[PDB]
Design an enzyme around this catalytic site. Structure first.
Site, PDB file in Angstrom:
ATOM      1  N   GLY A  17      31.895 178.297 -42.583  1.00 42.11           N
ATOM      2  CA  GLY A  17      31.286 178.271 -41.512  1.00 42.11           C
ATOM      3  C   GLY A  17      31.737 177.420 -40.309  1.00 42.11           C
ATOM      4  O   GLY A  17      32.495 176.421 -40.436  1.00 42.11           O
ATOM      5  N   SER A  18      31.219 178.023 -39.272  1.00 42.48           N
ATOM      6  CA  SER A  18      31.694 177.148 -37.853  1.00 42.48           C
ATOM      7  C   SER A  18      30.812 176.826 -36.956  1.00 42.48           C
ATOM      8  O   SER A  18      29.829 177.650 -36.515  1.00 42.48           O
ATOM      9  CB  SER A  18      33.078 177.730 -37.355  1.00 42.48           C
ATOM     10  OG  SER A  18      32.425 178.860 -36.400  1.00 42.48           O
ATOM     11  N   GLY A  19      30.552 175.796 -36.330  1.00 37.98           N
ATOM     12  CA  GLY A  19      29.511 175.590 -35.229  1.00 37.98           C
ATOM     13  C   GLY A  19      30.054 174.891 -33.716  1.00 37.98           C
ATOM     14  O   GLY A  19      31.158 174.990 -33.517  1.00 37.98           O
ATOM     15  N   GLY A  20      29.411 174.182 -33.233  1.00 42.30           N
ATOM     16  CA  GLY A  20      29.661 173.721 -32.050  1.00 42.30           C
ATOM     17  C   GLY A  20      31.085 172.911 -31.961  1.00 42.30           C
ATOM     18  O   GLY A  20      32.302 173.252 -31.016  1.00 42.30           O
ATOM     19  N   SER A  21      31.407 172.234 -33.014  1.00 42.63           N
ATOM     20  CA  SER A  21      32.553 171.396 -33.236  1.00 42.63           C
ATOM     21  C   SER A  21      32.811 171.092 -34.481  1.00 42.63           C
ATOM     22  O   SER A  21      33.719 170.282 -34.978  1.00 42.63           O
ATOM     23  CB  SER A  21      32.591 170.066 -32.309  1.00 42.63           C
ATOM     24  N   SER A  22      31.906 171.668 -35.428  1.00 41.99           N
ATOM     25  CA  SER A  22      32.072 171.378 -36.865  1.00 41.99           C
ATOM     26  C   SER A  22      32.362 172.597 -37.742  1.00 41.99           C
ATOM     27  O   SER A  22      32.220 173.705 -37.266  1.00 41.99           O
ATOM     28  CB  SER A  22      30.563 171.098 -37.459  1.00 41.99           C
ATOM     29  OG  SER A  22      29.590 171.714 -37.064  1.00 41.99           O
ATOM     30  N   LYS A  23      32.811 172.397 -38.951  1.00 41.50           N
ATOM     31  CA  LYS A  23      33.409 173.526 -39.900  1.00 41.50           C
ATOM     32  C   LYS A  23      32.865 173.050 -41.274  1.00 41.50           C
ATOM     33  O   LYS A  23      32.801 171.567 -41.610  1.00 41.50           O
ATOM     34  CB  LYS A  23      34.895 173.531 -39.721  1.00 41.50           C
ATOM     35  CG  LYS A  23      35.355 174.262 -38.498  1.00 41.50           C
ATOM     36  CD  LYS A  23      36.740 174.003 -38.334  1.00 41.50           C
ATOM     37  N   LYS A  38      31.752 169.237 -44.997  1.00 48.22           N
ATOM     38  CA  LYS A  38      31.364 169.431 -43.819  1.00 48.22           C
ATOM     39  C   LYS A  38      32.199 168.424 -42.881  1.00 48.22           C
ATOM     40  O   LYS A  38      32.227 167.380 -43.024  1.00 48.22           O
ATOM     41  CB  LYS A  38      29.811 168.944 -43.531  1.00 48.22           C
ATOM     42  CG  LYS A  38      29.250 169.654 -42.168  1.00 48.22           C
ATOM     43  CD  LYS A  38      27.787 169.698 -42.137  1.00 48.22           C
ATOM     44  CE  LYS A  38      27.032 169.909 -40.542  1.00 48.22           C
ATOM     45  NZ  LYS A  38      25.687 169.633 -40.574  1.00 48.22           N
ATOM     46  N   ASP A 132      12.805 173.848 -37.182  1.00 43.39           N
ATOM     47  CA  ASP A 132      13.812 174.925 -37.119  1.00 43.39           C
ATOM     48  C   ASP A 132      13.976 175.406 -38.442  1.00 43.39           C
ATOM     49  O   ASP A 132      15.471 175.661 -38.647  1.00 43.39           O
ATOM     50  CB  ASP A 132      14.935 174.719 -36.232  1.00 43.39           C
ATOM     51  CG  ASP A 132      15.649 175.798 -35.560  1.00 43.39           C
ATOM     52  OD1 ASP A 132      16.908 175.897 -35.753  1.00 43.39           O
ATOM     53  OD2 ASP A 132      14.871 176.573 -35.063  1.00 43.39           O
TER      54      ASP A 132
HETATM   55  C1  LIG Z   1      32.564 185.685 -42.891  1.00 40.88           C
HETATM   56  O1  LIG Z   1      32.558 185.150 -44.352  1.00 40.88           O
HETATM   57  C2  LIG Z   1      32.316 183.835 -44.607  1.00 40.88           C
HETATM   58  C3  LIG Z   1      31.265 183.613 -45.798  1.00 40.88           C
HETATM   59  N1  LIG Z   1      31.987 183.041 -46.958  1.00 40.88           N
HETATM   60  C4  LIG Z   1      31.239 183.068 -48.154  1.00 40.88           C
HETATM   61  O2  LIG Z   1      31.526 183.838 -49.055  1.00 40.88           O
HETATM   62  C5  LIG Z   1      30.348 181.995 -48.489  1.00 40.88           C
HETATM   63  C6  LIG Z   1      28.857 182.081 -48.651  1.00 40.88           C
HETATM   64  C7  LIG Z   1      28.534 180.620 -48.669  1.00 40.88           C
HETATM   65  C8  LIG Z   1      27.690 180.152 -47.899  1.00 40.88           C
HETATM   66  C9  LIG Z   1      27.452 178.765 -48.137  1.00 40.88           C
HETATM   67  C10 LIG Z   1      27.920 177.701 -49.379  1.00 40.88           C
HETATM   68  N2  LIG Z   1      27.679 176.671 -49.416  1.00 40.88           N
HETATM   69  C11 LIG Z   1      27.200 175.803 -48.589  1.00 40.88           C
HETATM   70  C12 LIG Z   1      27.347 174.374 -48.893  1.00 40.88           C
HETATM   71  C13 LIG Z   1      27.262 173.318 -48.293  1.00 40.88           C
HETATM   72  N3  LIG Z   1      26.915 171.972 -48.622  1.00 40.88           N
HETATM   73  C14 LIG Z   1      26.749 173.370 -46.693  1.00 40.88           C
HETATM   74  C15 LIG Z   1      26.549 172.215 -45.785  1.00 40.88           C
HETATM   75  N4  LIG Z   1      26.342 171.594 -45.393  1.00 40.88           N
HETATM   76  C16 LIG Z   1      26.945 174.828 -46.263  1.00 40.88           C
HETATM   77  N5  LIG Z   1      26.562 175.302 -44.853  1.00 40.88           N
HETATM   78  C17 LIG Z   1      26.411 176.589 -44.240  1.00 40.88           C
HETATM   79  C18 LIG Z   1      27.958 176.925 -44.189  1.00 40.88           C
HETATM   80  C19 LIG Z   1      27.918 178.400 -43.345  1.00 40.88           C
HETATM   81  C20 LIG Z   1      27.020 177.981 -41.969  1.00 40.88           C
HETATM   82  C21 LIG Z   1      25.710 177.655 -42.204  1.00 40.88           C
HETATM   83  C22 LIG Z   1      24.871 178.685 -43.242  1.00 40.88           C
HETATM   84  C23 LIG Z   1      25.657 178.927 -44.505  1.00 40.88           C
HETATM   85  C24 LIG Z   1      26.998 179.328 -44.216  1.00 40.88           C
HETATM   86  C25 LIG Z   1      25.561 177.688 -45.021  1.00 40.88           C
HETATM   87  C26 LIG Z   1      25.687 176.473 -42.946  1.00 40.88           C
HETATM   88  N6  LIG Z   1      26.966 175.819 -47.161  1.00 40.88           N
HETATM   89  C27 LIG Z   1      28.440 178.522 -50.199  1.00 40.88           C
HETATM   90  C28 LIG Z   1      28.964 180.071 -50.076  1.00 40.88           C
HETATM   91  O3  LIG Z   1      29.751 180.677 -51.134  1.00 40.88           O
HETATM   92  C29 LIG Z   1      31.381 180.617 -51.013  1.00 40.88           C
HETATM   93  C30 LIG Z   1      31.681 181.716 -51.920  1.00 40.88           C
HETATM   94  N7  LIG Z   1      32.247 182.679 -52.428  1.00 40.88           N
END
Ligand SMILES: COCCNC(=O)/C=C/c1ccc(Nc2cc(N)c(C#N)c(N[C@]34C[C@H]5C[C@H](C[C@H](C5)C3)C4)n2)cc1OCC#N
Length: 258
Positions: A17-23, A38, A132
């Site tokens: 994922g990506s945000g304002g200035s984070s990944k 993060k 939120d």
């Molecule tokens: C365009 O495709 C991109 C999507 N890619 C994927 O397949 C990921 C799904 C996913 C999503 C999240 C995740 N686990 C975590 C673990 C963490 N410790 C944090 C934090 N902080 C986090 N944050 C986010 C990252 C993205 C933006 C937002 C929402 C969600 C996705 C979770 C915060 N996510 C593990 C995940 O599984 C990885 C795999 N396979």
């Protein structure tokens, strides 16, 4: 290709994922173990949004001892330039899971709702209100839901007004009850396949629909009459009338199996 964090190298697999200035990255350590880092870029950020991340990390640490339903922060590194947070990777975020599976298992749904309540309860105890809450805020870690953040720092995408409590929309001229609403909306999705206001397209109308009591929310009958009372009570528009977390934790739907 590679990232250091407090004297440990991490090899980047993919970006999540990506945000304002984070990944958020998915990384491997030396023992080929999977994690999530993060990354935040501070070089470009206002002083009122730098200390948000400071609060986020501080609270994420403070709350490790207090529940295992809060996402695990293994180690963190912070300067004036960047932030690195080594966390759990997990399987999938809850928002990306509600979109995949169409038919949600009742046994699994209750289990998740328990986790959510626990995690939110824990943060409510230490005086934080996540004003939120979305499904994006929860991670799945081996069939166990875990809270990712407290909604102090800015949200990331891999933004909706669905889960917004009436009182917040009214606050234009916070309470733990506000999170109950958001939780209400999230359990609704897990029951009736959508949020209580998902069908409405226009935003200014939807916000009016949120605050307007004369707009009545439909609760179609279900084999689990217990789940129905929960949402019913979670979606009371008056925060004084709305159910509390401790009440929800003492509710038949959480405490009784079929
Ligand atoms: C365009 O495709 C991109 C999507 N890619 C994927 O397949 C990921 C799904 C996913 C999503 C999240 C995740 N686990 C975590 C673990 C963490 N410790 C944090 C934090 N902080 C986090 N944050 C986010 C990252 C993205 C933006 C937002 C929402 C969600 C996705 C979770 C915060 N996510 C593990 C995940 O599984 C990885 C795999 N396979």
């Amino acid at each position: 290709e590679c990232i250091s964090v407090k004297g440990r190298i991490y090899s980047i697999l993919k970006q999540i994922g990506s945000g304002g200035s984070s990944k958020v990255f998915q990384v491997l350590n030396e023992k080929k173990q999977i994690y999530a880092i993060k990354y935040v870029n501070l070089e470009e950020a206002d002083n009122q949004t730098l200390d948000s991340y400071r609060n986020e990390i501080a609270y994420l640490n403070k709350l490790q001892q207090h529940s295992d339903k809060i996402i695990r922060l293994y180690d963190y590194e912070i300067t004036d330039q960047y932030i690195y947070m080594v966390m759990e990777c997990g399987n999938i975020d809850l928002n990306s899971w509600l979109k995949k599976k169409k038919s949600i298992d009742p046994w699994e749904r209750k289990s998740y709702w328990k986790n959510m309540l626990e995690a939110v309860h824990t943060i409510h105890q230490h005086g934080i209100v996540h004003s939120d809450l979305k499904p994006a805020n929860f991670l799945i870690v081996d069939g166990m839901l875990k809270l990712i953040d407290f909604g102090i720092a800015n949200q990331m995408q891999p933004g909706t007004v669905n889960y917004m409590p009436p009182e917040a929309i009214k606050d234009m001229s916070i309470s733990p009850k506000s999170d109950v609403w958001s939780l209400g909306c999230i359990l609704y999705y897990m029951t009736y396949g959508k949020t209580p206001f998902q069908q409405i397209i226009n935003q200014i109308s939807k916000l009016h629909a949120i605050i307007d009591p004369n707009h009545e929310i439909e609760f179609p009958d279900i084999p689990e009459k217990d789940l129905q009372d929960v949402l019913k009570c979670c979606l009371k528009r008056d925060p004084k009338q709305r159910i509390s977390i401790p009440e929800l934790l003492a509710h038949p739907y959480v405490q009784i199996q079929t």
